[PDB]
Write a protein that binds this DNA or RNA. Structure first.
Ligand SMILES: [Zn+2]
Ligand SMILES: [Zn+2]
Ligand SMILES: [Zn+2]
Ligand SMILES: [Zn+2]
Ligand SMILES: [Zn+2]
Length: 143
DNA sequence: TAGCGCCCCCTGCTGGC
DNA sequence: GCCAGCAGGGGGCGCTA
């Protein structure tokens, strides 16, 4: 911990990533700003990734189908559809999932007590997931 | 420094069951 | 409906040409 942060218990080996840390967490200085919206980042790379949402530029092409992503890590995640990998394991029932959010959702829906459920206003049926309420609304009533 | 890399976060849909 | 699969837009770190 050579360059200790004067505001918290964290410390960094180079002064550069201390400046970036003090930006992300303490000073929130975002000098790299998008010229098409109010988005700004502590990092230029985050800015450029953001820019590709405006242009539709998908530079990272999947080699097994027509899919292509705006961020390298989204491609990596998409490849799990062709590979069937399931990197995340629930530490309670040990079921496996292709994404971390899916696991968190599983832990919330299967292993958390007294979870607030969603209710359909039109047929008085309890639904566990916000998105399943949306589908229920679209398929059943009128939506 | 900008540029890779990591991984997480969160959000919201599909379609088999 | 439940469920996991699956894609889009983001944050924060560790590292370094
Ligand atoms: Zn700090
Ligand atoms: Zn923008
Ligand atoms: Zn693909
Ligand atoms: Zn589980
Ligand atoms: Zn209903």
């Amino acid at each position: 911990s050579p360059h200790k942060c004067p505001d918290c218990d964290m410390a960094f080996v180079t002064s550069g990533e201390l400046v970036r840390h003090r930006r992300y967490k303490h000073t929130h200085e975002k000098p790299f700003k998008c010229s098409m919206c109010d988005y700004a980042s502590v990092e230029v790379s985050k800015l450029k990734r953001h820019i590709r949402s405006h242009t539709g530029e998908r530079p990272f092409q999947c080699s097994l189908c027509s899919y292509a992503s705006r961020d390298t890590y989204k491609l990596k995640r998409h490849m799990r559809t062709h590979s069937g990998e399931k990197p995340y394991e629930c530490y309670i029932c040990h079921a496996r999932f292709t994404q971390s959010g899916t696991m968190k959702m599983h832990i919330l829906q299967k292993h958390t007590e007294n979870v607030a459920k969603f209710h359909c206003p039109h047929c008085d049926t309890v639904i566990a997931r916000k998105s399943d309420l949306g589908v229920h609304l679209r398929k059943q009533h009128s939506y």
